[PDB]
Design a protein around this ligand. Sequence first.
Ligand code: HEM
Ligand code: HEM
Ligand code: HEM
Lengths: 83, 727, 309, 727
Amino acid sequence: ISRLGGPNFHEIPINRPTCPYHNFQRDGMHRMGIDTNPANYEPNSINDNWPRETPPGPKRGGFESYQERVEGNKVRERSPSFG
Amino acid sequence: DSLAPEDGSHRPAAEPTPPGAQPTAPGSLKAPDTRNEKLNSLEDVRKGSENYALTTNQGVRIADDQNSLRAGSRGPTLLEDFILREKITHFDHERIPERIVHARGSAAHGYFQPYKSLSDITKADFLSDPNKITPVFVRFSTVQGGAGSADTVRDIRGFATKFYTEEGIFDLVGNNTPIFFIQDAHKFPDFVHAVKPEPHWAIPQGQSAHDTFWDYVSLQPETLHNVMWAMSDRGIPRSYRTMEGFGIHTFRLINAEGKATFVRFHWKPLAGKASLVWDEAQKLTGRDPDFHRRELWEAIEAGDFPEYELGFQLIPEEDEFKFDFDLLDPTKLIPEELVPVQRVGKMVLNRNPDNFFAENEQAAFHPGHIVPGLDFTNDPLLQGRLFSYTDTQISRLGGPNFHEIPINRPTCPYHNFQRDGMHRMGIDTNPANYEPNSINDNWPRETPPGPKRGGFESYQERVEGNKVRERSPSFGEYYSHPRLFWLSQTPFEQRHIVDGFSFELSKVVRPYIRERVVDQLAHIDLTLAQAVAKNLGIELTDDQLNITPPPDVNGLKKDPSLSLYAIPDGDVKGRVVAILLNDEVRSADLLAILKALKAKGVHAKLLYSRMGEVTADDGTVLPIAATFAGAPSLTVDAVIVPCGNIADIADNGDANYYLMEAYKHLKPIALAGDARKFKATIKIADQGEEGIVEADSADGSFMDELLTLMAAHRVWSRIPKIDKIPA
Amino acid sequence: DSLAPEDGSHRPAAEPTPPGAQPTAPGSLKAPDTRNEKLNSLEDVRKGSENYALTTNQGVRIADDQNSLRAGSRGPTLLEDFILREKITHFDHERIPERIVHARGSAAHGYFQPYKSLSDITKADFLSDPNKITPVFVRFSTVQGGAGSADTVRDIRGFATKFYTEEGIFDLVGNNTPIFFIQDAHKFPDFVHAVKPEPHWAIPQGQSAHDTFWDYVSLQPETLHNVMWAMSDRGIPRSYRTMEGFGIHTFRLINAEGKATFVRFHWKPLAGKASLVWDEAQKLTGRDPDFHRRELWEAIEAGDFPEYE
Amino acid sequence: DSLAPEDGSHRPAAEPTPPGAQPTAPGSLKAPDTRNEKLNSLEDVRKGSENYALTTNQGVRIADDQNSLRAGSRGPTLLEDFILREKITHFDHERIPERIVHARGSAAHGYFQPYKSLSDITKADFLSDPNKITPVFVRFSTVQGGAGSADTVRDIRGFATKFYTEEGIFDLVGNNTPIFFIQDAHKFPDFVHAVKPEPHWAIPQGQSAHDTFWDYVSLQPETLHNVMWAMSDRGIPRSYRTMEGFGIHTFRLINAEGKATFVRFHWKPLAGKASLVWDEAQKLTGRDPDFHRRELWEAIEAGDFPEYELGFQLIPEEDEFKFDFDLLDPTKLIPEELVPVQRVGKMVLNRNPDNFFAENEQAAFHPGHIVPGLDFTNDPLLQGRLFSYTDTQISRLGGPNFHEIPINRPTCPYHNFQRDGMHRMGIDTNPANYEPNSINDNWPRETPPGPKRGGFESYQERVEGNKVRERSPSFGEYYSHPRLFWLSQTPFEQRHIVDGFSFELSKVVRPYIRERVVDQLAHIDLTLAQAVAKNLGIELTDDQLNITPPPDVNGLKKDPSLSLYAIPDGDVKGRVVAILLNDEVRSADLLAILKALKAKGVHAKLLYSRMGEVTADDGTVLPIAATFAGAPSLTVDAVIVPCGNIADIADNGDANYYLMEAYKHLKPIALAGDARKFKATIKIADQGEEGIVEADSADGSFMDELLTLMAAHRVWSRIPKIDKIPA
Ligand code: HEM
Ligand code: HEM
Ligand code: HEM
């Protein structure tokens, strides 16, 4: 946000995905993409909910985190195993 | 030189004056002696003017401030005019980014003071001694429109308080309704995008009456409780002084023994609750877009300071699952009938800023600004907010040193090993800028947690579960709390909700969206559903007619705390009355009227068709404050027309409409003597009617009937009559 | 999925419709075939939507866009939710500084074309051949209020035209009255400070009816010609289509032999001149603050294109 | 706690200590009592540390500053750790943009004081009374490399002085050579692009020895005078204390009667002029890249304050066309033989900063920062500069309020009607922010021009001509001033110029560019041309051999003021000597040596092969300052090897090379008693030679021969010998 001037650093040409990216993020300094989508929020009926969420799968699916188990208290404390 | 008028009239009196009696001023100049610890510490950055030479920012005095440096008086401007280029460069760069939400906003200075020590429940120093008063800075705001938008729009208002405490800044950032629209912070961008101006053409401003707003509401039934509030009269307040404030999340109070209590924060308006009606509120954004900014500035200059009670809803940790709604759900309110608001202290706003940009526009408020004695909960909307308000300052306020901007500075010490960043004001003399260190013997040092003046330590809540992006099933209920709100409304309050939905929905261009919103209403209450449906030409399906209503909230059928008008409370003090003058006004009437008003604390505006002054029948000179068209009925609370030469204003379209608008907006109208001629205008029975005070002369009882109606705010009984009036 | 109504009613017809007959749309979607050289070159940065997966800015598709990553469904949000933090960071930084003057404003695309060659008076290529049409972008504006202010206020309106010519951009930045308030640019900050909201309390918005404005007018008699214009019906127009435009300075036209001609530029409204009356204009900023933005968008969608000479 | 060593050794003595005797400190802590008016006014933003609790920027004390908030000690970090996110956000945003040129740079605090009143020539208050001392802030800099580049590179150095005067800030922004490379400011971007790292790969750093530099020189003959200076020893100074400074443009002094005088500004180094030699200077950027930053900080801590004389070259307006070079040409110098430098006052630098970023990195200097009594001329490079240094601050320093950053603030009043902009510190209480105004009775007011405390008014010079982008024909001569410079050099000075060009040019990959630069040299002087050509394997064309030399400069054939060494002046004070110890050093030698040095003000470094301490033959304990490899000969001025157990260091490769490097770099070497064994290393005749002081014991005369050689800086007579040495 300060080095590269703002939330659109991914539009600076070296940093751009060579694959598609579409979502409902709008505006911010030196915004290069002109969005033609009538909606900039989901859920929406007016552009029939596009772009849509994808379920997780073997190939080309959405990102889902690994469901690791967490148990403990809220502590600012170093694990004894690091000692 | 001259330019100033001698007779001194360019400067306001440094003492309380009524609304519009003087030009308004900077705080310091109007109230030199209202001080407090934050106000006194800003003294190091206040700049004066008088008897000072005009200079560049580098201290060089300017001889000609009217002309550019040109080669001959009709020739070209030279690049070496450094005086011109500095003056136009600072102009070129005046504007910073506005708040991405809540950009509109109005602020004032004042203090907080506790009623008693709350040491038994929290180890928070600002609440530890009734004798400890705390400097606050408060900014009231709207939510949708930009900083140039109008004040009396239909919207949620924000209410943010900065507490300059001895152990850190505590910001309590809340709004004026007790639940929010969204459960999870991940959806905040989609909701704000849907309320906001539409992307292709940036319309509308300051309004939710547009398709995308209502599209997202119909597809998201959790937004429905807070949309009910915004659709009520609660969405158009009379003043920032006449509204409640709420922190909306469940937080924790931690005492010195480690015991945690859940709490929800309230602000109770000591002037009563009161709102405008929509035709009034909408027309007034045209007639005066700064009405709420203006009237706050002027209540404080008249000494009608705003006051609020801080109030806690405390719930023991054991009762965490005693209700049939989840306490960590931000779309659920805790009925005061189930849990009472305990009054904890009082806040008084008694000083305006000197510079709006400097003090108000550069103020940063963030909910993560908590002190020892307070802590957070797992509320999913509170957890996300925590990320956001540090982040946003890096562009709004240019960088990581926004706390050095003077309104935002702790009045207590802060020392740590953070260095550099844009417009770094502190010059650090510490030989170390890392800890642990031996070279400055480890200073500044960490402090252990303790009962008073200790370090921040988080409450050790137990966490067990898997890493899941998933909503708790306890959040899954969308309809009993909107129906509890609906059932707690007076009948005319509910009318006004029907009419709020019907207006907004008439402005959706796509009819399937409107139908989709009526279906949702039929899950709340069918009467509500049928009323809105009718105004829209929609028929309910027999299946819609057979939807089973939601359950009660812990067997509660209504709570009257949720209504604005059901249990009455009313400031008549600080309200404003318009008096319609003519050229031979009867002074008998007038001195009686003004004495009565003055005893109650009510402000008058003497209004005519021309500016300047008229002369009462006894030769008294009365200065005119505005014309009838200049200060419409929209801006006062009641109209009084004294007797005198009535023939003068009787034929005047403006004077007559002044009364018809006021009638329709349900305000008290008082007619003395021949002024009763105007009954024929607003169509009243000679026999009289309620809310029209009339008499042979303005006197004691006439004024008593008027101030009594005024304490009741509007004449609700007139609502059947006002439909036939064309105004 | 559904969410869209089938019967198709969520989408507007891609053809001229009257005011309020359809929902309004993006230009490309409402008028797929109005093209010009500037419009076609923006094609490289237009982004579509349909049939596309929702992603992060780095191209990673999102499976759940409704929830944050928490340790248990009633637990705390985790700092490793990079999907949530990207979505809220771009939100946190949406807003750039607004124009320090003329912040309100409404714009449209179109073209310019000369009646004949003006080669005898100027060697300016955009005016050299009646057959050469030039892409323009035009923004109409007010002067005092912020971008969130109302459209039908009493004020001077701006009229700025960007000419995408074969030899460079020519911007003709003018207003709707033919003289300005100030003679020298050194005073511009003092005049704009005096019209603007007052420093202590930031009132009023979109209005000159306040002391400081009229203080500086009474002390500065050169402001009086243009104050007369602003005080006339000329200060409350019916539409951006119903007003004149002016460059206000004397400029020079230089032809190919080196001869210089002084010139003043005008824009003549082919729909006629028309203004509101003040009670109307003032009440309308309450009733519809976007009236001028709205009606320009809709004249162009109905095909009632604005034209000027 | 502990962490600090008790015995107190972590803190430096707050008094002058020699180089490397103590750890260095913040200014305030090392010199609590060097005060001045600018230093005292920064007191409001200095922050201490001791006995203070570690806090957030919002004042909340931190209990654990070692750990993040995680759900269990091996679990994930929680988004609600606001203490962690504030600490890492300020880190993430530490860096501002660096100066687009002159980014390297080192600064100090001090004062200026006039010798007498110059009221007869200028109405400038800082020069009006010999009793008026003025706070200055000075930053010395290089030109090409980034802020992370090395100090002893071959380049032009900058010399910028901020004068905090009673009537405004006067910035005198100059460099260390008297002419610039370019005539017109329009070409500044092309020249800086050509010197700078090349665009494709960003090489080289801190060097002009690359193709594009020399490409633009060969195509632009106006750059040749200042390239001659950069190619001389003038381009590698020994210290910022040992160089001249120059304003380069002709300016105007305006007195109280309106008379204008042209002036050129000089700074004369009261320590003498002295430079490194290139192998030394280049190797030293590897061995200590901070050598110039270090040695300035330490001269000031030892109390060897830098001092300079401000000197004026005054020329009456009538003599504007008396020379055969245009006075407004920035590539032409005015020979001191034609116009003398009159010494006007003195400047002393006597206090270091407390925080480099805050004070040094945020300092803004701009030549348009002039005061009443001074004015500009039509110099085309001065006119363009005027645009630039206001502009650049809007991104470097984030905005139009850089003058509020504490190092940059006027110590005198400044009031005007400029409002808002990013990190606006002043809260303006003025009811007006425009003039003319009646409501604050027109304050702050314009001031008429006058003799003392009046407004700025420009000198009414006559302008006639057409609007033309055209260079004056008077600027058209490119070669007599480089040949005047060349002819005024001692013979070894000229050698060093030949060798500067030959090294740089050997690094151009494209040979046509090198040939093109030799052609240009043949227009200056053929000897110069032939010497460089030879080192490069280039032959001059008989036509090149027949180029007619340029004319004299007003019949001047040489001026010795342009040489560094021709008229000698030499500080031995503040210089540094290395003493090579062994394990049984003869104390007789050592106490004589150190007494002698101390009487002259010279600093010693006792150096060994190991750290810790050795013991003299009488049992004295000597602490070792560095190893031979740790503080190379490169960093001292002379080497003394006392007698004692010589056998110890005699076989040591480091101790022997220490002497060969020093020999080669033309430094004085003194050998006492058995230490004379090392003559065999540096190959000296038993009969002796100049610059090697040798004797049976270190004594009075031995030290006298040494300090005398030292006042003469290098042993130039050795230059024929040093070619056979492999070091
Ligand atoms: C219970 C719900 C919420 C309440 C009561 C609330 C209240 C407020 C208020 C009163 C302000 C105005 C600040 C001012 O006057 O300067 C504000 C600003 C803001 N809010 Fe919220 N908000 C809520 C939810 C959210 C969420 C979920 C986010 C972000 C994920 C958010 C992000 C922000 C930001 C970025 C600003 C502007 C911040 C600033 O200018 O410092 N808010 N909010
Ligand atoms: C004949 C008098 C003037 C006219 C006709 C005029 C017209 C305009 C117009 C139409 C705009 C709006 C730009 C847009 O729509 O984006 C504008 C912007 C602006 N004007 Fe003026 N202006 C005048 C005088 C001045 C003066 C004297 C100054 C400065 C010394 C000035 C400074 C600016 C600046 C800084 C902006 C905002 C610039 C931008 O956003 O690019 N104007 N002016
Ligand atoms: C006689 C020729 C020149 C001299 C003696 C000179 C000297 C200097 C010096 C000493 C600095 C360093 C400032 C510091 O220490 O903070 C500087 C900075 C700079 N100079 Fe020059 N300069 C010359 C020509 C130019 C020209 C022609 C331009 C621009 C058209 C220019 C633009 C700048 C800028 C933009 C900076 C950085 C400014 C800043 O950081 O405030 N200089 N110059």
